[PDB]
Amino acid sequence: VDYKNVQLLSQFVSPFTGCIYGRHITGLCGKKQKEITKAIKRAQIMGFMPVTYKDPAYLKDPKVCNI
């Protein structure tokens, strides 16, 4: 899980608010949940990922979240 892979990290945020999903929604084991969380924050603060919304270019990727 890399902070530059914004496509993968956008598969774990809310399309309308940009909030990160929890493990009850994502289904990840807690360690990979922590990796995804830290990567998302790193990307957001380093100017790679939007924070208040999901980047529209990635709205049509496979839905891996149970929401």
Binding site: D2, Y3, K4, C29, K31, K32, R42, Q44, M46, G47, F48, M49, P50, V51, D55
Partner: protein, 105 residues
């Protein structure tokens, strides 16, 4: 150790982008670094408007500079990036490849 510099440069014409890239890599080598690769991720619209050097940016070029630097270099390089006017945002991280995959089986 091994570091990665993620660089967000100002949306400029090719000669000036080349000049800025040469300048930053020259600074890296001046502070004792061995630059390994330089990769261009592309020119793209910023996720959000970024204010730097009294100018508002909505577009920027993304570059990656892989290098090996002595540990004391990092801080100095950060200061230099704070002074270069063509850089919206530079961040130095420990290279992801050094962090070896944990054995989660």
């Amino acid at each position: 150790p091994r570091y990665e510099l993620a660089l967000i440069l100002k949306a400029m014409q090719r000669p000036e982008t080349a000049a800025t890239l040469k300048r930053t890599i020259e600074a890296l080598m001046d502070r004792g670094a061995i630059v390994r690769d330089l990769e261009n991720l592309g020119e793209r619209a910023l996720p959000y408007r970024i204010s730097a050097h009294s100018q508002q940016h909505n577009r920027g070029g993304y570059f990656l500079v892989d290098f090996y630097a002595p540990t004391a270099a990092v801080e100095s390089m950060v200061e230099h990036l704070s002074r270069d006017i063509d850089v919206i945002r530079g961040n130095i991280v420990k290279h992801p490849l050094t962090q070896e995959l944990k054995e989660c089986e």
